[PDB]
Design a protein around this ligand. Sequence first.
Ligand SMILES: Cc1cc2nc3c(=O)[nH]c(=O)nc-3n(C[C@H](O)[C@H](O)[C@H](O)COP(=O)(O)OP(=O)(O)OC[C@H]3O[C@@H](n4cnc5c(N)ncnc54)[C@H](O)[C@@H]3O)c2cc1C
Ligand SMILES: Cc1cc2nc3c(=O)[nH]c(=O)nc-3n(C[C@H](O)[C@H](O)[C@H](O)COP(=O)(O)O)c2cc1C
Ligand SMILES: Nc1ncnc2c1ncn2[C@@H]1O[C@H](CO)[C@@H](O)[C@H]1OP(=O)(O)O
Length: 609
Amino acid sequence: PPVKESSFVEKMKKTGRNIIVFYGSQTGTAEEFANRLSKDAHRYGMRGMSADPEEYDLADLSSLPEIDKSLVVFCMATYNGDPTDNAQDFYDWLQETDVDLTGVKFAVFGLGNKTYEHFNAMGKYVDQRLEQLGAQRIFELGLGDDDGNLEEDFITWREQFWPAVCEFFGVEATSSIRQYELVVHEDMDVAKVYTGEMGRLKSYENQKPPFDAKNPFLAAVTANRKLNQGTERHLMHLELDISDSKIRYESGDHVAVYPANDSALVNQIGEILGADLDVIMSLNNLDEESNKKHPFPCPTTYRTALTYYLDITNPPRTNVLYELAQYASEPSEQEHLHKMASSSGEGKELYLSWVVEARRHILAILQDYPSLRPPIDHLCELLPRLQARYYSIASSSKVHPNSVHICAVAVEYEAKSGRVNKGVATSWLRAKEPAGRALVPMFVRKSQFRLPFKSTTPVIMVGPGTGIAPFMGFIQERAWLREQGKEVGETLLYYGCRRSDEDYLYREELARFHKDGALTQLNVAFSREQAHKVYVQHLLKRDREHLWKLIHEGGAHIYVCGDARNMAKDVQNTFYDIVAEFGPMEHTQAVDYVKKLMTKGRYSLDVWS
Ligand SMILES: Cc1cc2nc3c(=O)[nH]c(=O)nc-3n(C[C@H](O)[C@H](O)[C@H](O)COP(=O)(O)OP(=O)(O)OC[C@H]3O[C@@H](n4cnc5c(N)ncnc54)[C@H](O)[C@@H]3O)c2cc1C
Ligand SMILES: Cc1cc2nc3c(=O)[nH]c(=O)nc-3n(C[C@H](O)[C@H](O)[C@H](O)COP(=O)(O)O)c2cc1C
Ligand SMILES: Nc1ncnc2c1ncn2[C@@H]1O[C@H](CO)[C@@H](O)[C@H]1OP(=O)(O)O
């Protein structure tokens, strides 16, 4: 619980702001959107500001009417049906408060993903709640879908939002504007230069607990081995030494890591722009009143910024390309970049195929539109921040209290852009070689994916491919409970891979556990050892009788991990069918029954894309 800032309304008054855009974000997208909306205000005679709801008391919303033509916008993302961490406070307040918001004008743009159970739950909630409290909606709720193209949904909403705002407040719709100023440092002492740390200067060198997202622990990579036999893919297992970090974790938790971009990619960006990446500088907010003094840790070199603080691989969003159009000396290229921000037409189609679908990163665009040569400092101000990557801890703290295990597949594919794209965190992790030791800045994030409290409760685990990760931890722990004399219920694993002798991850360890009885059943679907595809859900269907027994009589907990795209849903449907047959009951009731298991904490998910 952070110390709240002074009333955001009083701040708006002292700075002449009439619009405030709050962001509920975890990977920085909502914050990006909020900043874009805040900046838009300027182009409409108004003036806004972005703000972290966590640093304020939203009860002060009731004072917003004291500012003429005032307006609050909420750009909120949803995470596992809940508010983002930074907006949990706002959410709890919204539920317990009874404050009257008469006179308050708002608008909400929800960032979500249709593939989840509770799509845009937070945005939908905030939008409905503010109205119930007496506030009035100035523009319809925006429903962004990261499963299609969030950026386009945002563009569309934003394009209609502003005219609606202008029409209601009687405002007019009336250029390039830097948010930061560049200050090169020639006489800069080395001890004051950021070299990639996230919080306090030298926090990576001088490690002080407790460690978290703002102060990650640099864990030594003690192991890093290939898990599969083939060469088409690279699946790996790493062990991070967290001794003396005082960090605690449990099977089911996730470990986050801050990676470094590819040095060659960073080098080329500087080389193509003819910039000296080793120039030590700082980018200082031109708004001396904003709490955001820099876009990232400063002072630091461009090289360090592009390596540790900036995202240089993901397809640039439209506003970035829009702002860069001014630096392309070829009219046709400036025109293309300019139209990427269109809400329809060829400009939109080109953005979706040439940039998104092709997966062109910033360097790719700089190479494919050679007249585009922006100054390095402005590019750094425009790029999004490099985010940490999450991995499902593959070990049990009951067995490995001082080590965190990771099971992952290295990302590397041929993009239609014409080049081979490499996954940032996985290429970096793959390069980490045990024993100048190899360090991984990291931190643990607690999750609700947990083994049952009672050792006697049966467990049904389903995790094909890398989805096996959390379960290696579950299995280690359940075996441990047995070795300790505890009474353990059935422990079932439904795992899957292409072929027994090619990508059967942890084959040896799983055989051992099965032999010893830690694993009651080891059901493996080898999808390519026969003409037909054989998947985990096929084995669940096979064992439908017994699984129903465990679910209906034993109170078994279900766990699904891995591919959220198709595997998760296919597995869920098979459970719908098992319930419909043995209940018995109509599909409609089977679906309700399964979704009820989820709320009662007996059907947990740890899926990703
Ligand atoms: C909660 C959670 C748990 C996770 N657990 C694990 C885990 O235990 N093990 C694990 O392996 N991963 C897991 N991940 C995924 C992990 O966080 C990273 O997203 C993944 O490892 C890739 O990161 P990267 O930085 O290497 O690739 P990035 O540089 O982040 O690139 C990823 C992007 O590349 C694009 N891409 C990937 N393949 C292709 C393709 N072939 N064709 C076109 N585009 C493609 C997609 O846009 C993809 O999102 C988890 C993710 C979440 C959210
Ligand atoms: C672990 C995880 C869980 C998510 N859970 C949900 C969810 O329940 N509902 C939803 O609509 N979107 C969900 N999403 C999608 C995000 O809401 C969407 O990607 C959003 O754009 C992220 O915004 P941010 O960068 O501002 O945090 C999830 C994403 C991740 C990575
Ligand atoms: N829709 C799905 N449901 C369950 N498993 C799937 C799946 N799609 C692919 N798989 C399998 O998940 C395992 C890990 O990726 C692979 O054996 C893969 O088989 P396939 O690649 O032969 O289709």
